[PDB]
């Protein structure tokens, strides 16, 4: 469709170098993020329209939910390291917001075990160098873009999507306008 | 020495006479208020520990959300007048922050109708002078304590909770610590 700077997206004053092509930030404590994931399927729709060779990166943030927010960022790194994102994303969102069975770090471990991950493997991953590095990358990425809130999506480390300037009257149209904006920006 | 001024609570420079025993302020637009209510359940837990005869009052504020902010204060007045607070709190918080489908006074009305309140019953209360007095009461209480931010909780019109002086690694322990402090302050 037609896109205007300052409307469907905004340009960053300081372009982050080496940033992932499409970077999405979220928090398991974030209500609207739960909506984006479970109901709207924003990520899935954006993926369907992305050109060949463009990869989507999704990072968890620390600034929500206090000290537990930090543990979730580490648990997300474990999810990425084990490659079980699609198995634990909804269960974690529900555990924190819906059923409220996740009140501390040990509860996060149970979610993974329930998904079929061995406890020994989870524990080893939790303390791994790979995970400690991933936690560092996530925290740094947020700092580089001076992230103030979630959900958020950045393209080529230069643009940031602005759903507030998008047509929200019809949710099906909205989702497609969002995905089309990402696609348009990824080739700019 | 266990509970100190400046620590888990602060004392008001100018105490409010005639203020409700436990007064909580919030806004449906306030992110931390969503956490407090939907995830932590602060109000419920505090109620469960208050002495016999100590009543809790919850008021909405105007300083967030602009136009819609004031509409929500009037709608909260309607919820109070009709005694349907427990029916509309969740859908209002979710409507504003989770689904972001609440964009005008009409959308707020839809929430009440869907909750079971009759259209004519809602419209009558909405335009009633009883509701206008409830709005004035809410505004007055905020003015009395020079409220500049939410969430906020006051006890006996003298003390204001300071959640910043407590651990948030375990939500259940934080909640219980918050509730215990309110109880302490109420019998002080």
């Amino acid at each position: 469709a037609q896109y205007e700077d300052g409307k469907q997206y905004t340009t960053l004053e300081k372009p982050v170098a080496g940033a992932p092509q499409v970077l999405e930030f979220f928090s398991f404590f974030c209500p609207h993020c739960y909506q984006f994931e479970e109901v709207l399927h924003i990520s899935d729709n954006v993926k369907k329209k992305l050109p060949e060779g463009v990869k989507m990166t999704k990072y968890h943030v620390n600034f929500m939910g206090g000290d537990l927010g930090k543990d979730l960022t580490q648990a997300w790194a474990v999810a990425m390291a084990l490659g079980v994102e699609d198995k634990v994303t909804v269960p974690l969102f529900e555990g924190v917001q819906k059923t409220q069975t996740i009140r501390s770090a040990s509860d996060i471990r149970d979610v993974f075990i329930n998904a079929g991950i061995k406890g020994e493997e989870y524990d080893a991953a939790w303390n791994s160098f790979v995970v400690k590095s991933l936690v560092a990358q996530q925290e740094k990425a947020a700092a580089d873009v001076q992230l103030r809130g979630v959900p958020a999506m950045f393209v080529n480390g230069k643009y940031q999507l602005n759903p507030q300037g998008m047509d929200t009257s019809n949710m099906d149209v909205f989702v497609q306008q969002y995905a089309d904006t990402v696609k348009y920006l990824s080739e700019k």
Side-chain angles (χ1 to χ4, degrees), chain A residues 1-12 15-46 48-51 53-131 133-147 149-188:
Chain A
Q2 200 252 8
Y3 314 96
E4 288 175 44
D5 194 337
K7 199 178 177 191
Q8 294 81 14
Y9 70 102
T10 54
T11 308
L12 306 186
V16 180
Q21 297 166 297
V22 175
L23 181 53
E24 181 184 345
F25 288 101
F26 80 107
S27 173
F28 285 114
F29 277 96
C30 166
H32 198 43
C33 298
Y34 188 2
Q35 179 75 356
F36 261 31
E37 194 67 46
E38 256 294 86
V39 174
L40 273 33
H41 298 103
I42 290 290
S43 303
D44 297 343
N45 282 274
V46 170
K48 285 180 184 173
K49 287 182 165 173
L50 284 179
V54 181
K55 198 186 70 65
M56 266 197 85
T57 308
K58 184 182 292 195
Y59 287 165
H60 189 271
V61 304
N62 284 339
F63 55 82
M64 286 187 79
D67 293 342
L68 227 195
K70 209 92 74 282
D71 292 319
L72 283 170
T73 297
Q74 185 162 351
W76 186 237
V78 172
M80 289 189 279
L82 291 173
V84 294
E85 299 104 309
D86 47 78
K87 304 289 184 298
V88 301
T89 299
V90 173
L92 285 167
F93 259 126
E94 291 191 2
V96 173
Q97 297 181 52
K98 187 180 166 189
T99 57
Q100 295 159 27
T101 42
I102 295 178
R103 312 297 283 186
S104 73
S106 41
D107 294 311
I108 303 173
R109 185 172 184 274
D110 291 334
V111 171
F112 283 76
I113 290 179
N114 263 239
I117 302 300
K118 298 163 184 171
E120 302 75 75
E121 187 62 15
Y122 177 82
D123 291 333
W126 183 268
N127 296 289
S128 79
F129 174 63
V130 184
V131 166
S133 303
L134 285 178
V135 172
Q137 283 178 233
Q138 293 182 93
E139 299 181 332
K140 178 189 169 56
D144 285 344
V145 292
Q146 301 160 84
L147 187 64
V150 290
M153 197 171 288
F154 298 82
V155 182
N156 297 332
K158 303 153 197 156
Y159 316 103
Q160 177 181 176
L161 278 84
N162 182 31
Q164 276 60 230
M166 287 181 189
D167 185 11
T168 48
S169 48
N170 180 309
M171 293 313 258
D172 295 301
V173 172
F174 169 74
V175 173
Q176 297 312 315
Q177 186 185 10
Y178 194 101
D180 286 341
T181 305
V182 177
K183 179 186 177 58
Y184 167 78
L185 297 174
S186 65
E187 302 178 325
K188 202 167 83 79

